[PDB]
Symmetry: C2
Subunit: 60 residues, 2 copies
Amino acid sequence: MEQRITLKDYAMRFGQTKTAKDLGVYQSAINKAIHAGRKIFLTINADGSVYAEEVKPFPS
Amino acid sequence: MEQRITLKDYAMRFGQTKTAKDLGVYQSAINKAIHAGRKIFLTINADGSVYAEEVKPFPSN
C-alpha cells in the first residue's frame, strides 16, 4: 500500500530541498508549483521511492 | 477503500454506455477521450459512486 501526499504538505515536512532532490528537479520548481497552487500529489512507494503527478478533474 | 481503474479498462469491462452514464457525460466524450490516449483514472467509491480524474506526471519530461 502506498501513501499519497500533497506537494505542499510534504515539502512542509521535508523542505524544498529534499523534496527537490527527491523529485529530481531544481528547487525553484517546487516553490513555483506550490506558489501557483497546482494539484500535485506525490506517491511514495512502499519501497521508498517517490513520484509526482498533477491531477485534473474529468471532465473540466 | 476505493477501487481505481483506467477509463479504457473500465470501458471494457462495462461498455461505453455505462461509462458515460456513470460519469454523467456522453458517449462521444468517452470515446474521444479514449482515442486520444488521455490519462484518466476512475475512482470507484465504496457506495458505488464514480468519479474521474486526469492524471499527469510531474514534472513533465
